[PDB]
Amino acid sequence: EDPETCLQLNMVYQEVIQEKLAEANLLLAQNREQQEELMRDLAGSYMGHFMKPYFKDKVTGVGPPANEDTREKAAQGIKAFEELLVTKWKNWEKALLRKSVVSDRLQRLLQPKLLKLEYLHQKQSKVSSELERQALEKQGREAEKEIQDINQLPEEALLGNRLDSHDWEKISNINFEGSRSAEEIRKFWQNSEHPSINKQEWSREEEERLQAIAAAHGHLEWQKIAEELGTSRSAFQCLQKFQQHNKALKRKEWTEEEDRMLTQLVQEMRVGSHIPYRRIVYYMEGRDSMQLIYRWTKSLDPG
Amino acid sequence: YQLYRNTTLGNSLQESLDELIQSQQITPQLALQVLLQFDKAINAALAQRVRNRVNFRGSLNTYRFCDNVWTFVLNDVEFREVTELIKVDKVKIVACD
Amino acid sequence: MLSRLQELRKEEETLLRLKAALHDQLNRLKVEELALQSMISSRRGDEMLSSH
Amino acid sequence: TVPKLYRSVIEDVINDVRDIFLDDGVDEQVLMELKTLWENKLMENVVVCQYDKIHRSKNKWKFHLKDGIMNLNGRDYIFSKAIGDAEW
Amino acid sequence: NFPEYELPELNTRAFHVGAFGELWRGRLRGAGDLSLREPPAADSDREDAAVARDLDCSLEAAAELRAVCGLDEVIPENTDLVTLGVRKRFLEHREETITIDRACRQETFVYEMESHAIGKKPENSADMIEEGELILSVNILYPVIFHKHKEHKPYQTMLVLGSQKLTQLRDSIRCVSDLQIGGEFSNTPDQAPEHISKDLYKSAFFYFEGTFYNDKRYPECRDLSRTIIEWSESHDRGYGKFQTARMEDFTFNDLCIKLGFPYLYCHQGDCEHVIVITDIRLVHHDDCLDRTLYPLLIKKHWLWTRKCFVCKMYTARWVTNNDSFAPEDPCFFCDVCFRMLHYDSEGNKLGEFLAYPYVDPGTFN
Amino acid sequence: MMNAFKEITTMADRINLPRNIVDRTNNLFKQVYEQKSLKGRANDAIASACLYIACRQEGVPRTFKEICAVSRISKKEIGRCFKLILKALETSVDLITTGDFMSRFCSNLCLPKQVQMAATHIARKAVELDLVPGRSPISVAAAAIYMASQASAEKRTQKEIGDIAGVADVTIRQSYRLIYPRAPDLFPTDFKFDTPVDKLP
Amino acid sequence: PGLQTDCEALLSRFQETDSVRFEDFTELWRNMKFGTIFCGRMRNLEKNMFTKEALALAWRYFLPPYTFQIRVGALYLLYGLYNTQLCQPKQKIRVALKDWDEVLKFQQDLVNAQHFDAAYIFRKLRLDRAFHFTAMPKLLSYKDPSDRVMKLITSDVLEEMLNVHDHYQNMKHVISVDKSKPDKALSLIKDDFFDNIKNIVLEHQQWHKDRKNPS
Amino acid sequence: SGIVPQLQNIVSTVNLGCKLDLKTIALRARNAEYNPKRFAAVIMRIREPRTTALIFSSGKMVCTGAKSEEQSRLAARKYARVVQKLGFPAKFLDFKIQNMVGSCDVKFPIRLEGLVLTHQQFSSYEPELFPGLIYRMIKPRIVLLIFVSGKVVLTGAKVRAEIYEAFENIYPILKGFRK
DNA sequence: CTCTGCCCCGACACAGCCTCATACGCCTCACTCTTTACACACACGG
DNA sequence: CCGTGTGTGTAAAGAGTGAGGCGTATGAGGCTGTGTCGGGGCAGAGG
Ligand SMILES: [Zn+2]
Ligand SMILES: [Zn+2]
Fold first, then answer.
1. Quick one: three-class SS letters along chain F?
2. Chains D and C touch, contact meaning at least 3 pairs of CB atoms under 8 angstroms apart
3. Chain F neighbours among H 67-126 (CB < 8 Å)?
4. Strand I contact at CB of residue H103, distance < 7 A
5. How does strand E256-257 pair with strand E263-267?
């Protein structure tokens, strides 16, 4: 009858279809947001970087400078966890240390004679004489003979006497990969790894002699004990053997006060059915975790 | 090598050798071979005695290169040696390869 | 997780095709709307010849 | 770490020049007094060192120096390497 | 703000914890859902009436829903499913390969450590935690005490309480670095122990998404973050816009942090721990309801205990360096062996060495 | 003038390429030696460039790395001499399309013909869909072959494809990520496989 | 381990019934002895871990984009699992904030559609306080889905589209000044809209079936 | 179109008019580069114009890096003055700009394949060697590096007008091959 | 058959853009045998 | 009938390699240019 009805009907149709596009375009936006989330998942990436150097340069990889508190703590000789970090000596490490010490001693002994030979050759180059040149040649032959004698030096006389100043810091540079400090290497070589330290298994007579010497001379001068033991042993080894064969190390008998102390420690440090005995033993005098386990399981638990 | 005989150590070497030669008890030769073997020894040890990591940042003021020797001059530099910082207004770096 | 990726992308193509069809629908609808406006102007101009 | 490095260098140099001192005809007393005067005399910021790679960016210089010595603020320091950065 | 993922399954967006708790409490406001009370024919009628009111159904409908929806061990198991069959095979293998079949130390430790305080009713009746308190299951990374800590990073989980002021967790984080004793006792080991590091260095700071909350509570405390911010202001460092706080005027609710994202906790100069907020949840009725001890430990790593190198029977009391007797440089001794080896009868420092008190990380942590 | 035709024949022998390509290479060498617009260049480099040009013209183009892998010179001078010869001879060579390099790359690998066609379709539909804008066709072919192998019964990791096509594994990774989301629609409609195409590394 | 498959089977064996009543889930539980999934010698630590894993699996199956039938089956599975636990401190279902509104709307839809069984199960799960209202579903450190097409186009949507189209054609027929023919200015109306959308939807259905059919 | 290239590099040459001892310049210059085993020139760098000058023993200096001819000439004069202060009779003779390289972006991806297909006689496109198409323009002797991202680099021009005319000549073709 | 001086070349920068392709390395993950540690247990012998 | 002397389970180190992702650095390309040092054909005696 009149297009006005057409106008209004088309308005309402456009309204409904535009609402349909509104819903559909919201779905499209959600789907594209999901796709962007997935892409960033592909581009995503950690904890380890933030262990000691929570802040580390994107250029160099170093942390913030030592604070005044850190410097004061270091001044008081308080060790960081890295300083107190101890690692076992592997057999390959021991062999490498031995060979490295041999090579270092060879180089140290060769350097002086090598430079002497070089100086003799340099003097020969500009001597402006013949008889003096022959004398210099004879001296060079003597130097070469000395170098050859040094080269053929046996390992026994080459190693040293476990107290001579080697350049142990070298052992920590070329042979080792920096995992071991110079002090650690030198102490290990001087005290334990040197051939002048008897690493052979202890004999019954040797153990008896060690016990007798410790009893007589006392258990408090173990250096003189090792010296008097006769065999080439370190004070550390003698003390270790004495302790491992000692009988007064542990009390081996329980008392009422000790029982009360153990019960108090257990009740204080329990977390339930779990009883960490190694941590209890810290306050316990002259006791082992096994003894505490036995006492708490057999004589301090109602049944 | 004519590079490491300029620090406090090398200057001490030069001064001690000068005092000894002026005392008329060593010859200049022994002095110069001693200096050469010192150069060799410091080259060996300095490259073989050390592991402390350092990292420095600054504003390079000037630089130079000739006959295989670099000469940098930097301003407002901070050197970062193990767990400690050194701030220097101006620093000269002389390298020789 | 690519199975969900392919399901999502196929749904994306589905809804893109639906949007393309409906956008053609709206473009032609608006063309019709302009035609209606022109025709109603022309028709209403036929009774304005006698006014106060 | 610098004092121990200097002591080691002194020990090495004196030990390996002992042979020349003996050969040329100067007694070891001269050698030991040289040592003693050496430590006695031991007691501008300049860095004498070795360069491994002087990388040049557009204007950023990345300095990969090998081992070297620095004389910063009247105090001697030593490094095995220096990975530094600068802007020209 | 709503907690939403930054990374796919690794990290969330930075949001205010207080707003998160407010949203949760408003969406559960007056629903009977936040009770914190112990679980409890007349009550059947009331339950049916409540069901009818909530579900728009008749009383008979509520009664039949209650009846039909009713609830619906014995080690023997037959007619096994997939998972049940796998479990049966695993138990058979364990029985045929194990001889004692008793709870191992680690499993009992972990279980009793997690379930140490669950449903533990407070004694005072005055430390009530409000209905909804946003308990944070934080975790503190253990400091590297053994070289292998890098391969597997140990951590201890702490159920902190929302709205609790900072320094409540800092005073609760148990670390061996706070018990270290400074000074050298080589000359004589009977010196009066110096004040533990907890007293000498009271300073510490948290760092949560570019904000240094410094522990300036005590006069002995100094601004630990200062250095860092200064060292950050010198040059472009990749870190910018550092903030500062006092750590005593803030609560965990006020923190705007992410979940699963590394944050820092520094103490005792440079002892750094990684704080990670695993998740945030409203307090339930089946967990600890206290406040005096609620900042407790949910899990700890049970570190190894160092032993005297001479005798392996006892733990370590002293650490010696540059010793003329020990094979290694950092040699650990007990009191007995240390006294026996490092001194004479009348009493004097034998040989050359530097001996210091050693606190076992495996005992106070 | 001699010792280059022998060198050209030796160059072809290592690739087992038909003789007509060798004849075309010799003819191109003759023309370039007549022009002498690149006299300073070594004869071996000219021969290698002529071999590459001849291989390109016949419709079985190779890659510069596969001419260098047989030649005694580096790819840099091979490309320099290629451009110099193209300029001096006032000749033209059709652009390399991805379709050329699968018939050989898949032949060196132990993939079946079905996987060959699948990879060809993937690489093509990728190139028309502009999923790999301005990237070397060899890398696109490597990525398509990687998809075809991973989805098919015979699986090849990136190292084998990189060695065969002479494309760094990182380049393969990048070109695979770029067309990674659009993997399914690139496969042929009728394609059988034992590992679903809806899951891939 | 490998519990997911079992749950899937249950869900499958529920959706195959095309039912929402909780009773059918009860007979399925009794037939498969699902309550025995926790039975068997196993210690408290791994017991609570396994309960946590099962509850998390059931909850994630209960959330979208799974079908309504699968969602109700997952809700019933959650109820059965939580009510049948051997841990003294019954493990709680971890519920996130972003999902709370969706679950509330799902419950509203369930009650509106007279699915009073699932509504009562959900209300009971709320009352006994079986939900840990966490920030994210899991601890952060370091199928039968629903497609958008049904939400876009369905039976009623196309029915009302075609009704509007028919009304539009009739009003076109009546608008023209002459009943013989409509005006030439308004003759662009298309009849292929329904045909086009039908072709597109059947193309999607064909793709889906040839996908889930293995090669 | 309304977009014009912005110059990125200008290479110019000048004759100082006297032989130089490169060793002295290296030892006395503030920022000189001299490695005789590596190259036979002294490379001096300055900050104000941000240019680099290679000075040869024969007295010919080559300045690069200037973004426009005024700065190139000023930098060349600065280098000449610096050499003069070093005790050399250096002058400023025969200053010539040898190259002017600029970059620009047409702001739409380009189909290189079709471009080379329809313009083979000028363009050389080798994706394996260089992922950019090389168009050897013939009216001005300018080389164009065109990339799929739309970046176009003009090189080989001696004056700025050559760069502008080359870009205006190439723009319609790129628009016709708009991807 | 075997060198052998000789003029006409290629290859070093380094100036600033620009995209893809190639290579180095560096911190962290995996796992795997091998011990390592700590609680608990089972005899064991007269 | 209460002592001890060896066994056992199972997570926790300890190296011991070995792999892998990603960030950075490098190359390749025409550009036009200037010193210079190797060097690749070139016929050429010379035997
Ligand atoms: Zn700590
Ligand atoms: Zn001891």
1. CCCCHHHHHHHHHHHCCCHHHHHHHHHHHHHHHHHCCCCCCCHHHHHHHHHHHHHHHCCCCCCHHHHHCCCCCCHHHHHHHHHHHHHHHCCCCCCCCCHHHHHHHHHHCCCCHHHHHHHHHHHHHHHHCCCCCCCCHHHHHHHHHHHHHHHCCCCCCHHHHHHHHCCCHHHHHHHHHHCCCCHHHHCCCCCCCCCCCCCCC
2. no
3. 109, 112-113, 116-117, 120-121, 124-126
4. yes
5. unpaired
Q: Give the three-class secondary structure for E298.
A: strand
Residues G123 and G157 in one domain: no
CB proximity list for F61: less than 8 A, separation 6 or greater:
F55, F96, F100, F101
* CA dist E341 → A135, A224, A242, B17, B91 (Å): 59, 11, 12, 48, 51
Nearest residue to H5 (alpha-carbon basis) of H153, H169, H126: H153
Angle (CA) G95 G96 G102, round 5°: 90
Cis peptide before G65 (omega within 30 of 0): yes
Distance, in Å, from the CA atom of F74 to the CA atom of E309, rounded to the nearest integer, reads 62
Instruction: Report the C-alpha gap between G87 and E22 in whole angstroms.
Output: 32
H56 in contact with nucleic chain J (CB within 7 A): yes
Residue G91 lies in a domain: yes
Q: Do C38 and G185 touch (CB under 8 A)?
A: yes
Residues G158 and G184 in one domain: yes
Window 125-164 of chain H: CB closer than 7 A to strand I:
127, 130-132, 145, 147-151, 153, 155
The residues, any chain, with a CB within 8 Å of residue F57's CB and separated by 6 or more, are F24, F93, F94
Domain boundaries, position H59: 12-97
Q: Using the CA of A293, which nucleotide's C1' is the nearest one?
A: I39
Boundary of a domain, candidates E299, E319, E348: E299
Strand J, CB < 7 A, residues 120-139 of H: 124, 126, 129-131, 134
Residue G158: domain span? 148-212
Residue type, F28: L
Total Cβ atoms within 10 A of residue B36 = 14
* Residue E338 lies in domain: 304-365
Taking alpha carbons only, the member of E221, E200, E220, E256 closest to residue E3 is E256
Residues H88 and H106 in one domain: no
What span, in angstroms and rounded, lies between the C-alpha atoms of D65 and D83?
6
Helix axes F113-128, F137-151, angle to 10 degrees: 130
Structural domains counted in chain G? 2
What lies within 8 Å, CB to CB, of B67 at 6+ separation is: H23
State how far the Cα of G120 lies from the Cα of G115, in Å rounded to an integer: 9
In a domain, G25, yes or no: yes
DSSP 8-state secondary structure symbol assigned to residue E176: G
Tell me the one-letter amino acid at A115: L
Q: How far apart are CA A255 and CA G178, in angstroms?
A: 123
H9 appears as a binding residue in the annotation:
yes
Whole-angstrom distance, CA of residue A15 vs CA of residue A21: 10
Give yes or no for a contact between H30 and H78, defined as CB atoms under 8 angstroms apart: no
- For residue B91, what are the domain limits? 52-97
Find out whether E271 and E175 touch, Cβ atoms under 8 Å: yes
Pairing of strands E15-16, E256-257: antiparallel
For tokens 């006389």, the residue is: A157
E150-CA/J14-C1' distance, Å = 13
| Residue G63, SS3 per DSSP | coil
**∠G7-G13-G14 over CA atoms, to 5°?**
90
* Per-state percent for chain A, helix, strand, coil, to nearest 5: 60, 0, 40
Residue for token pair 């102490």: A187
Number of domains in chain H: 2
Give the E-state strand segments of G53-209 in sequence order.
93-95, 131-133
* B64–H30 CB contact, under 8 Å: yes
- For E268, what's the count of Cα atoms within 13 Å in the CB-facing half-sphere? 27
